[PDB]
Design a protein around this motif. Structure first.
Motif, PDB file in Angstrom:
ATOM      1  N   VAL B  36       0.893  -1.158   0.033  1.00 20.39           N
ATOM      2  CA  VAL B  36      -0.013  -0.077   0.197  1.00 20.39           C
ATOM      3  C   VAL B  36       0.720   1.176  -0.201  1.00 20.39           C
ATOM      4  O   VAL B  36       0.514   1.587   0.296  1.00 20.39           O
ATOM      5  N   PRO B  37       1.616   1.451  -0.214  1.00 24.50           N
ATOM      6  CA  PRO B  37       2.599   2.618  -0.120  1.00 24.50           C
ATOM      7  C   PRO B  37       3.917   2.183  -0.931  1.00 24.50           C
ATOM      8  O   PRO B  37       4.493   1.214  -0.732  1.00 24.50           O
ATOM      9  N   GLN B  38       4.230   3.396  -1.728  1.00 29.23           N
ATOM     10  CA  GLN B  38       5.799   3.448  -2.479  1.00 29.23           C
ATOM     11  C   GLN B  38       6.742   3.330  -1.550  1.00 29.23           C
ATOM     12  O   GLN B  38       7.849   3.284  -1.740  1.00 29.23           O
ATOM     13  N   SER B  39       6.492   3.769  -0.307  1.00 30.16           N
ATOM     14  CA  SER B  39       7.497   4.194   0.969  1.00 30.16           C
ATOM     15  C   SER B  39       8.162   2.811   1.236  1.00 30.16           C
ATOM     16  O   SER B  39       7.527   1.974   1.490  1.00 30.16           O
TER      17      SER B  39
END
Lengths: 83, 49
Positions: B36-39
């Motif tokens: 859920v996040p590119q982080s």
């Protein structure tokens, strides 16, 4: 999700993806199954259905027999007091 | 790992570690959703020297 401008998260996984296979198919199973061995009506056990006695009561039979017979000794006569 | 490494010798060692996020294979408590996040995640390892 966080999106950060100016580095933005691509707006999709795009069209450059590598389709790797067409193996997607599950072939339906078709089958005929028969479990038909002769059945015999009975099974042997050591014991089924018994409600065994944990203790019994005492039990008995009965008898009597004989006759009415006797040897007797009596008190002597005495003077009568009153009346 | 060799019990001893004699003077002039070279020993070969192998070690494995399991860094858990989820508690177990059946209990996902502690697991991390990373879809859920590119982080980025960071697994930092400091080796012997």
């Amino acid at each position: 999700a966080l999106i950060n401008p100016q580095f933005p998260y691509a707006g999709p996984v795009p069209i450059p993806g590598p389709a790797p296979t067409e193996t997607m198919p599950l072939l339906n199973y078709r089958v005929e199954g028969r479990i038909a061995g002769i059945q015999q009506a009975r099974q042997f056990m050591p014991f089924l259905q018994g409600p065994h006695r944990a203790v019994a009561e005492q039990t008995y039979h009965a008898i009597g027999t004989g006759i009415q017979m006797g040897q007797t000794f009596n008190q002597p006569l005495i003077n009568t007091q009153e009346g | 790992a060799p019990a001893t490494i004699a003077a002039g010798a070279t020993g070969e060692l192998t070690m494995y570690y399991w860094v858990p996020l989820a508690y177990s294979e059946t209990d996902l408590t502690g697991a991390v959703l990373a879809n859920v996040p590119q982080s980025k995640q960071r697994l930092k390892l400091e080796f012997a020297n």
